[PDB]
Design an enzyme around this catalytic site. Structure first.
Site, PDB file in Angstrom:
ATOM      1  N   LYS A  85       0.806  -1.231   0.000  1.00 31.34           N
ATOM      2  CA  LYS A  85       0.000   0.000   0.000  1.00 31.34           C
ATOM      3  C   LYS A  85       0.840   1.284   0.000  1.00 31.34           C
ATOM      4  O   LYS A  85       0.442   2.292  -0.576  1.00 31.34           O
ATOM      5  CB  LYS A  85      -0.998  -0.010   1.169  1.00 31.34           C
ATOM      6  CG  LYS A  85      -1.888  -1.263   1.222  1.00 31.34           C
TER       7      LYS A  85
ATOM      8  N   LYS B 274     -18.390  -8.723  -2.860  1.00 36.83           N
ATOM      9  CA  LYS B 274     -19.098  -8.294  -4.089  1.00 36.83           C
ATOM     10  C   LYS B 274     -20.260  -9.217  -4.398  1.00 36.83           C
ATOM     11  O   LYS B 274     -20.098 -10.444  -4.341  1.00 36.83           O
ATOM     12  CB  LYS B 274     -18.163  -8.297  -5.310  1.00 36.83           C
ATOM     13  CG  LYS B 274     -17.131  -7.173  -5.332  1.00 36.83           C
ATOM     14  CD  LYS B 274     -16.322  -7.223  -6.609  1.00 36.83           C
ATOM     15  CE  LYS B 274     -15.163  -6.256  -6.538  1.00 36.83           C
ATOM     16  NZ  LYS B 274     -13.871  -6.995  -6.472  1.00 36.83           N
TER      17      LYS B 274
HETATM   18  N1  LIG Z   1     -11.571   4.482   2.615  1.00 34.52           N
HETATM   19  C1  LIG Z   1     -12.675   3.706   2.482  1.00 34.52           C
HETATM   20  N2  LIG Z   1     -13.904   4.187   2.790  1.00 34.52           N
HETATM   21  C2  LIG Z   1     -15.032   3.433   2.681  1.00 34.52           C
HETATM   22  N3  LIG Z   1     -15.032   2.148   2.254  1.00 34.52           N
HETATM   23  C3  LIG Z   1     -13.858   1.530   1.909  1.00 34.52           C
HETATM   24  C4  LIG Z   1     -12.585   2.294   2.007  1.00 34.52           C
HETATM   25  N4  LIG Z   1     -11.597   1.458   1.616  1.00 34.52           N
HETATM   26  C5  LIG Z   1     -12.194   0.263   1.293  1.00 34.52           C
HETATM   27  N5  LIG Z   1     -13.538   0.300   1.468  1.00 34.52           N
HETATM   28  C6  LIG Z   1     -14.514  -0.810   1.214  1.00 34.52           C
HETATM   29  O1  LIG Z   1     -13.866  -2.056   0.906  1.00 34.52           O
HETATM   30  C7  LIG Z   1     -14.137  -2.449  -0.452  1.00 34.52           C
HETATM   31  C8  LIG Z   1     -12.876  -2.990  -1.131  1.00 34.52           C
HETATM   32  O2  LIG Z   1     -11.752  -2.763  -0.270  1.00 34.52           O
HETATM   33  P1  LIG Z   1     -10.236  -2.965  -0.771  1.00 34.52           P
HETATM   34  O3  LIG Z   1      -9.390  -1.775  -0.362  1.00 34.52           O
HETATM   35  O4  LIG Z   1     -10.302  -3.364  -2.246  1.00 34.52           O
HETATM   36  O5  LIG Z   1      -9.718  -4.210   0.158  1.00 34.52           O
HETATM   37  P2  LIG Z   1      -9.366  -5.702  -0.374  1.00 34.52           P
HETATM   38  O6  LIG Z   1      -9.430  -6.626   0.816  1.00 34.52           O
HETATM   39  O7  LIG Z   1      -8.131  -5.657  -1.243  1.00 34.52           O
HETATM   40  O8  LIG Z   1     -10.645  -6.035  -1.263  1.00 34.52           O
HETATM   41  P3  LIG Z   1     -10.563  -6.960  -2.570  1.00 34.52           P
HETATM   42  O9  LIG Z   1     -11.417  -8.482  -2.208  1.00 34.52           O
HETATM   43  O10 LIG Z   1      -8.889  -7.360  -3.043  1.00 34.52           O
HETATM   44  S1  LIG Z   1     -11.484  -5.981  -3.988  1.00 34.52           S
HETATM   45  C9  LIG Z   1     -14.707  -1.209  -1.142  1.00 34.52           C
HETATM   46  O11 LIG Z   1     -15.636  -1.505  -2.205  1.00 34.52           O
HETATM   47  C10 LIG Z   1     -15.385  -0.491   0.003  1.00 34.52           C
HETATM   48  O12 LIG Z   1     -16.676  -1.086   0.207  1.00 34.52           O
END
Ligand SMILES: Nc1ncnc2c1ncn2[C@@H]1O[C@H](COP(=O)(O)OP(=O)(O)OP(O)(O)=S)[C@@H](O)[C@H]1O
Ligand SMILES: CC(C)(COP(=O)(O)OP(=O)(O)OC[C@H]1O[C@@H](n2cnc3c(N)ncnc32)[C@H](O)[C@@H]1OP(=O)(O)O)[C@@H](O)C(=O)NCCC(=O)NCCS
Ligand SMILES: [Cl-]
Ligand SMILES: [Cl-]
Ligand SMILES: [Cl-]
Ligand SMILES: [Mg+2]
Ligand SMILES: [Mg+2]
Ligand SMILES: [Mg+2]
Ligand SMILES: [Zn+2]
Ligand SMILES: [Zn+2]
Lengths: 431, 517, 438, 121, 127
Positions: C124, C176
């Site tokens: 990140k 999703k």
């Molecule tokens: N700053 C934020 N504010 C509000 N909601 C968030 C924020 N960051 C993430 N989310 C929520 O988390 C979802 C996806 O988060 P990601 O940052 O992509 O984490 P991830 O675990 O990598 O998810 P995937 O399974 O790889 S898409 C988004 O569609 C939002 O619903």
């Protein structure tokens, strides 16, 4: 010609035997083997009990005299072939000492574990100075096979005659054979273990299961111990003979007839009891298997042959030399192609079997390359098979579908072959 | 078909000489003496101990008339005692009485565990003594007593009880390792001869060598039996299993070295994990100086009877095919082999069986290299299964930084419940496994009090709503739940032991007729 | 040489998806299967197949999922089979740089981006600074959020294209549930602003293969914020394929074969020739039971009939009547994608197909999917990432009459046990002529 | 069932009573197979549906992952996170958590189907 | 991707009767270019699994796989005058071996077919 091709094919050590221990009947093969510059291991078959004074025909001098004769006939090694596993440990200690005093040739002992004590006899033979012994990998040892190789080796580990074989590697190779043997479930017998009755009947380990199954066929399964007794009785009736391929088959045929027809040996030789002898018995009494040292019992021989005259010369001495050129032309014309010298040797031994195999191979190609379960059972729906037709060069075969049988009575099997569709039609052999 | 009348045999010599001079008679005897194990160890190994009284009792007369020179029939103890009630719905005491009646000339022999008789756990001394007393009354003449760690102190209570009943006390030393292998010197020749001396001083009438895994090799038998007979004046009795496919070589080597008695199973129930073949051993000895004087034809006739009996037990055959020198690696007792392989299969390990056998060898060394026979063998089995299941090396098992939940049998063994190996238990393993529970090094039975036998008797009698016999009470002391279940099934179903075997397991087909006495 | 055999280091619907692309390109396929997947259809849909996770080369059998995550097992079978390339699908090893490393060590092409691309995008700190360095906004709030993501493709020659965007805001808990292409709440100007950011990220990372640049959009301000790049194909690639006409999986393959985007051989048009055609959405039908807190059901499927027609795409190939759903793996039954020229019509088309499916023997999430796409906030594109979690009417129990099953139960009971009133009373003459209405 | 909703029902086969006292009638309904189980009340099976039945929810419940016959039971009162039963078709069903099992609904050389309740914590 | 189905009528357990047109399903394949559309149709047809009745799938596949179909040179007389759409030839080692496999798969082996079978079993592994 056969011995010539066997040597060319890669055999180094020929263990040559005769079913009545008739040295005369062994000379042609022994000469051929020496001519090819390979090992002639001349075998003496063991029967009876050299330590039993009540059965003196097969006494110690019988064996030491044969060893002397075989050496004079040009053996490089003498074998004791105990095809029925009758040699007992005390006898081995006497026999192998005496043999090694009688000839300077090395001695090689072969036995079967039908009694469940053959490993004791092997180890007695080793202690007595025997030069070489046979055994089967653990996973295919015991009962009618040879005694266990791994355990015999372990017994000798650290001793002065230690064979220097790694038990862990024997175990690994046996584990492989165990897995291989599992594939042959169809061909297993119902034998549960050791049987001292072997000392009664003296059926060779290689015969026992075949004969028992053959008795079952004729409705005699419940009378198996009567067949075994009739086998012992018939042996005595024939003059007490060596019983190994093919003389063993003759005594088995006789015994089954006695039980099926309710005939004692007295009925068998009787003037007034009509008997239809098995063809193998007539042929043996005629002279086709050779001559035992006391000859064939005359009252029996006379009755069985029904006027046909027996002979006592070596059976092969009666046969005209084959015209090998003409015979080769014959098979080549049948197959409409040249055959190799090896295939010719096959045709000379088994003309019908070879010819049939040569035609099957033309139809099916190299089926030996198939793994065993595919060979015996083919492929289940959706099943994948890997087979090498060449040393590249793997075929990935999948059974995708099998049609219902039409009319013309054929069935279409749909394969995938290395990513490509392949449809093959075959008869539905049950319509 | 037999005769005539029955000729006096070893039973009459025991009765008229007494046990100590009977053992002297055995020692002096020039011929080798034979014990037939078909009625106990032979079917325990090959048919999960499921052989029924009906088939056993029906041939005892034949043995009595046809083989009157046999030393003994091994026909009781080991697994027969609980299996007969739990799986065959029949009384082991009745089976023993029928054999006694049918074979009044031959010694009847049981296998007894020193620590607990025929039971499944440790019991107070008074309970173990009560059982031995009943076994003697019920018809046992010759008690082969063993301890799973060869711990003489754990055998004293039973040995003294046997001597008190004036029956034969045959104290066994379990064979393990390899005396001629100078790189495993823990179980060397002096180990065995010192034990034979200790057991003679403890009042044995006969010493046995109990080779439960069939590990003794012929060259070792030659040295061992010579040394034993020089170390003690007592007769020596040799028991082995044929897992390797060469155990008859060892038996014959023992006979040549002067051993007084040997065990074998009738041909039809011999070989592999059973004993080696009786008829062939007798044939090998025929006409020799030590010829046991047993008619081969009669051995074959009785074996043919056992072959037809065995056919009825097709449900209980294992898939074992033949000899295995793998036994010298793992040292699993012949009586354990099939059970442990069936357990591995049930745990999903059938395809890693040879891995289990290696884990068994490694686990044995981890425990300090111990004697493995019921119950210690089970502990090593449990350990091996866990090591394969969880992918644990011996180093993983003992390490301070890998958590392991040890099998209960392992915890209990390291605690001290099975007794003490000559070396004690390995300290780091024991500490890890006990998780703070203190181990003990005394005889387990010395920690159990005295059972209150009059109160225990009233408990079973109240439950069944009737008096029970002393034999039934002994059954209840050893196997409370199994005996209770059996007595209640006997109340409902009557004397099912009298039914022929096919009717017992499968009932009657339509139109089928049976005879039952 | 050019790719001629691909091993798919995956299972279920994504393996079957790759097998289709590869076979259409004339390329041989290899399936892998764990023992628990012994009856799995992907195993039978490849040209060649190998078990992973059992056998004497291992000290112990591997777990149902563990088998597929085993880099050692995957490489072993890839070698055995002579595969030229490995497609990792999504999930499992598709984001594992250790796995890409193993592939390269073995001389097997990994179908996806380089290991160092993965490492940079997976941290990140690096991912944020890269976006910052090319003037892409990064995250404040966001209380009313939408999840929008750009589909990119990059080739080994420095060409990157975007395949426009998807809306992924309809999420339950954080997973999703319904994805849409294009995002229907965006203007054209917004759509192009987002594409420009995504092309910047792709080019800055020298991205190879298919990837997704994910953004948060603040619904109150219209501001976009870069969140992460997912360096792999995704389950929702299907909506993008249907609205652009571009096969993403074939593009991945040609790209790793060395083709240039823009050439007919790449399967990918130049940017100027990439365009949106209508609207699509995708629903994943699963055994998650809305009647049991979405606990996945399992057992034998007694009936399975999908529904197709104009504008329906199916990516399944795993359910059929007879099939056993285990609890070892994700409970997907089939992915349904619906297309139409306009978004309300695509909704009506999804709704018809979902209602026309018949699946029996296991519970499914069909009523819940129906509820979502039937909701006014879904129809008018006013939902945020909190929509499902804050909308209880979606959870309303449905309750079927289930009349035919009850009648069959009656008929079985009377057929086997009789009616108490017809008992041992006389029976009609057994002929017997039905009354005919005149 | 209503106007314009005509069902076609065929009785294809009726099973023997099973070990649970249930008879399966194999129907064809609108062309599709449907199996329906009812108690064999005629032969004394009032009180019957027999085997529970695991709830996909709870933790608590040990449900069969697959159909088969149980080959061995290894438990009846509590431990670890360990083989509880095996099923032949042998598998080899493991405890998912630490606990004391308070019921073993098998049993067996019993036939079971996926989701049947094997044991309860 | 790119497959449309208009069937809805066939399923496992369906009975095909003699009364109407013997249609199972109508398949439509799409791609940006006509050759890709063919490869797509061909993959889908070959991936279908229909058992219990015969189908015209191999005929459909021969048509779309024909050189003249691929180069758009066919006429209305194409099928009626193209014998190779209804035929096929091979004589090599692999075909003979597939002939063996087919024969044993359908008929079993005389030495094995009525004897005990191997457990349903670990293949042997060379050390
Ligand atoms: N700053 C934020 N504010 C509000 N909601 C968030 C924020 N960051 C993430 N989310 C929520 O988390 C979802 C996806 O988060 P990601 O940052 O992509 O984490 P991830 O675990 O990598 O998810 P995937 O399974 O790889 S898409 C988004 O569609 C939002 O619903
Ligand atoms: C459906 O939901 P519901 O509220 O349970 O509706 P119903 O009470 O009508 O029962 C449904 C069953 O009745 C039957 N049925 C319903 N409508 C039918 C009609 N149009 N024609 C023939 N059968 C019909 C079907 O078997 C249906 O089962 P399915 O939904 O799995 O296809
Ligand atoms: Cl021939
Ligand atoms: Cl008990
Ligand atoms: Cl896992
Ligand atoms: Mg003596
Ligand atoms: Mg994300
Ligand atoms: Mg992510
Ligand atoms: Zn031989
Ligand atoms: Zn024993």
């Amino acid at each position: 010609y056969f011995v010539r091709q066997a040597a060319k094919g890669g055999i180094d050590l020929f263990r040559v035997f005769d079913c009545l221990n008739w040295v005369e009947n062994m000379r042609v093969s022994m000469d051929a083997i020496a001519e090819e510059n390979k090992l002639c291991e001349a075998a003496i078959c063991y029967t009876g009990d050299i330590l039993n004074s009540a059965r003196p025909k097969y006494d110690l001098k019988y064996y030491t005299n044969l060893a002397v004769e075989l050496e004079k006939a040009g053996a490089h090694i003498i074998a004791v072939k105990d095809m029925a596993g009758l040699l007992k440990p005390a006898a081995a200690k006497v026999l192998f000492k005496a043999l090694r005093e009688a000839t300077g040739l090395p001695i090689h002992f072969h036995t079967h574990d039908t009694s469940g004590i053959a490993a004791a006899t092997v180890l007695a033979a080793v202690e007595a100075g025997v030069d070489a012994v046979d055994a089967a990998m653990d996973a295919l040892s015991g009962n009618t096979s040879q005694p266990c190789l791994g355990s015999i080796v372990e017994a000798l580990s650290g001793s002065e005659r230690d064979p220097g074989l790694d038990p862990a590697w024997i175990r690994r190779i046996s584990f492989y054979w165990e897995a291989v043997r599992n594939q042959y479930a169809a061909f297993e017998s119902d034998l549960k273990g050791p049987a001292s009755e072997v000392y009664l009947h003296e059926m060779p380990g290689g015969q026992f299961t075949n004969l028992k199954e053959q008795a079952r066929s004729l409705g005699l399964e419940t009378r198996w111990h009567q067949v075994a007794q009739a086998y012992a009785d018939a042996n005595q009736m024939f003059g007490d003979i060596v019983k190994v391929t093919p003389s063993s088959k003759v005594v088995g045929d006789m015994a089954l007839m006695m039980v099926s027809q309710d005939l004692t040996v007295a009925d068998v030789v009787s003037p007034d009891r009509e008997v239809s002898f098995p063809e193998s018995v007539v042929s043996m009494l005629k002279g086709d298997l050779g001559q035992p040292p006391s000859g064939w019992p005359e009252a029996l021989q006379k009755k069985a042959l029904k006027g046909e005259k027996p002979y006592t010369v070596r059976p092969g001495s009666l046969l005209k030399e084959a015209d090998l050129d003409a015979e080769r032309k014959v098979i080549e014309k049948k197959l409409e192609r040249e055959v190799s010298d090896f295939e010719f040797a096959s045709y000379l031994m088994y003309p019908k079997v070879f010819t049939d195999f040569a035609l099957a191979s033309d139809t099916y190609g190299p089926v030996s390359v198939l793994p065993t379960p595919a060979y015996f059972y083919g492929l289940a729906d959706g099943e994948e098979l890997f087979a090498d037709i060449e040393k590249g060069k793997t075929l990935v075969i999948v059974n995708q579908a099998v049609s219902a049988t039409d009319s013309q009575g054929m069935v279409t099997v749909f394969f995938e072959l290395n990513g490509q569709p392949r449809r093959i039609k075959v008869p539905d052999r049950a319509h | 078909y037999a005769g005539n009348g029955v000729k006096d045999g070893t039973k009459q010599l025991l009765d008229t000489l007494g046990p100590k001079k009977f053992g002297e008679w055995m020692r002096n005897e020039k011929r080798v003496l034979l014990t037939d194990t078909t009625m106990r160890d032979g079917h325990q190994s090959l048919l999960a101990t499921r052989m029924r009284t009906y088939d056993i009792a029906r041939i005892a007369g034949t043995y009595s008339h046809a083989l009157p020179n046999l030393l003994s029939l091994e026909c009781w103890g080991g697994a027969t005692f609980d299996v007969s009630m739990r799986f065959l719905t029949e009384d082991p005491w009745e089976r023993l009485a029928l054999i006694r009646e049918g074979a009044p000339n031959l010694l009847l022999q049981m296998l007894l565990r020193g620590a607990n008789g025929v039971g499944y756990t440790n019991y107070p001394d008074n309970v173990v003594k009560y059982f031995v007393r009943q076994a003697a009354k019920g018809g046992i003449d010759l008690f082969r007593v063993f301890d799973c760690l060869n711990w003489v102190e754990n055998m004293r209570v039973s040995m003294d009880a046997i001597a008190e009943e004036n029956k034969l006390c045959e104290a066994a030393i379990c064979y393990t390792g390899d005396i001629l292998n100078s790189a495993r010197p823990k179980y060397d020749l002096k180990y065995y001869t010192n034990l034979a001396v200790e057991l003679e001083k403890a009042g044995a009438h006969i010493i046995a060598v109990k080779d439960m895994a069939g590990l003794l090799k012929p060259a070792a038998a030659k040295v061992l039996f010579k040394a034993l007979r020089e170390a003690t004046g007592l007769p020596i009795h040799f028991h082995t299993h044929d897992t390797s496919g060469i155990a008859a070589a060892t038996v014959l080597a023992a006979v040549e070295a002067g051993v007084d008695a040997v065990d074998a199973a009738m041909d039809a129930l011999s070989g592999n994990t059973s004993q080696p073949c009786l008829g062939s051993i007798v044939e090998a000895l025929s006409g020799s100086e030590r010829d046991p004087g047993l008619d081969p034809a009669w051995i074959r006739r009785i074996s043919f009877y056992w072959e037809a009996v065995r056919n009825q037990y097709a449900a209980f055959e294992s898939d074992l095919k033949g000899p295995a020198s793998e036994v010298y690696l793992h040292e699993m007792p012949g009586g354990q082999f099939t059970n442990l392989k069936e357990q591995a299969r049930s745990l999903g390990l059938e395809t890693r069986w040879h891995q289990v056998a290696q884990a068994y060898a490694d686990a044995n060394q981890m425990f300090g290299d111990i004697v493995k026979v019921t119950p210690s063998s089970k502990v090593v089995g449990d350990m091996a299964l866990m090591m394969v299941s969880q992918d644990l090396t011996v180093a993983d098992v003992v390490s301070p930084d890998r958590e392991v939940s040890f099998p209960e049998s392992v915890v209990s063994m390291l605690k001290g419940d099975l007794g003490q190996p000559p070396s004690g238990w390995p300290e780091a393993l024991q500490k890890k496994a006990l998780k703070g529970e203190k181990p003990y090094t005394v005889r387990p039975g010395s920690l159990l009090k005295e059972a209150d036998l009059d109160a225990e008797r009233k408990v079973i009698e109240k439950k069944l709503e009737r008096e029970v016999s002393d034999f039934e009470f002994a059954s209840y002391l050893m196997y409370p739940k199994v005996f209770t279940d059996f007595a209640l099934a006997s109340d409902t179903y009557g004397p099912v032991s009298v039914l022929p075997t096919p009717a017992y397991f499968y009932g009657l087909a339509d139109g089928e007729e049976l005879f039952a006495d | 040489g050019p790719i001629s055999k691909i091993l798919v280091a995956n299972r279920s619907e994504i393996a079957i998806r790759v097998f289709r692309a590869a076979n259409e390109l004339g390329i041989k396929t290899v399936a892998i299967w764990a023992e628990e997947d012994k009856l799995a259809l992907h195993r039978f849909k490849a040209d060649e197949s190998y078990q992973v996770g059992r056998g004497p080369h291992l000290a112990r059998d591997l777990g149902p999922i563990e088998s597929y995550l085993s880099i050692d097992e995957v490489i072993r079978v890839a070698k055995l089979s002579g595969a030229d390339a490995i497609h990792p699908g999504y999930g499992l090893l598709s984001e594992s740089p250790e796995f890409v490393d193993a592939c390269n060590k073995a001389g097997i092409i990994f179908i996806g981006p380089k290991a160092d691309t993965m490492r940079q995008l997976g941290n990140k700190v690096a991912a944020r600074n890269l976006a910052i360095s090319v003037g892409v906004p990064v995250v404040k709030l966001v209380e009313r959020a939408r999840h929008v993501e750009s589909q990119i493709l990059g080739d080994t020659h420095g060409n990157v294209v975007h395949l426009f965007e998807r809306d992924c805001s309809v999420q339950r808990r954080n997973q999703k549930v319904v994805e849409r292409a294009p995002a229907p709440y965006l203007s054209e100007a917004q759509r192009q602003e987002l594409a420009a950011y995504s092309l910047k990220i792709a080019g800055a990372t020298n991205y190879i293969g298919a990837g997704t640049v994910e953004y948060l959009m603040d619904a109150d301000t219209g501001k976009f914020y870069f969140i992460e790049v997912n360096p792999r194909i995704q389950v929702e690639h299907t909506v993008t394929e249907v609205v652009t006409g571009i096969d993403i999986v074939k593009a991945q393959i040609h790209i790793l074969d060395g083709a240039a985007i823009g050439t007919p051989q790449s399967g990918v048009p130049n940017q100027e020739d990439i365009r949106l055609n209508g609207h699509a959405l995708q629903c994943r039908v699963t055994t998650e039971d809305p009647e049991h807190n979405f606990i996945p059901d399992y057992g034998r499927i007694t009936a399975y009939r999908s529904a197709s027609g104009f504008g329906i795409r199916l990516d399944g190939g795993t359910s059929y009547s007879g099939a056993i759903i285990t609890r070892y793996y994700d409970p997907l039954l089939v992915k349904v994608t619906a297309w139409a020229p306009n978004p309300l019509e695509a909704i009506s088309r999804m709704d018809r197909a979902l209602r026309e499916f018949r699946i029996r023997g296991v519970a499914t999430n069909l009523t819940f999917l129906e509820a979502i796409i039937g909701h006014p906030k879904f129809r008018d594109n006013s939902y945020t990432t909190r929509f499902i979690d804050t909308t209880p009417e979606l959870f309303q129990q449905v309750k079927r009459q289930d009349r035919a099953t009850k009648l069959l139960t009656y008929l079985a009971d009377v057929t086997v046990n009789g009616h108490p009133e017809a008992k041992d009373r006389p029976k009609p003459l057994e002929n017997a002529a039905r009354p005919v209405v005149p | 069932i209503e106007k314009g909703k005509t069902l076609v029902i065929v009785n294809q086969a009726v099973s023997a009573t099973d070990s649970q006292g249930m008879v399966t009638v194999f129907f064809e309904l609108n062309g599709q197979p449907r199996r329906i189980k009812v108690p064999d009340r005629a032969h004394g099976a009032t009180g019957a549906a027999v085997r529970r039945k695991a709830e996909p929810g709870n933790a608590a419940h040990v449900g069969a992952p697959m159909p088969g016959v149980i080959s061995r039971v290894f438990v009846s009162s509590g431990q670890a996170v360990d083989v509880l039963v095996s099923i032949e078709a042998e598998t080899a069903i493991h405890a998912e958590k630490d606990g004391t099992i308070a019921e073993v609904l098998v049993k067996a050389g019993d036939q079971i189907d996926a989701k049947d309740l094997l044991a309860v914590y």
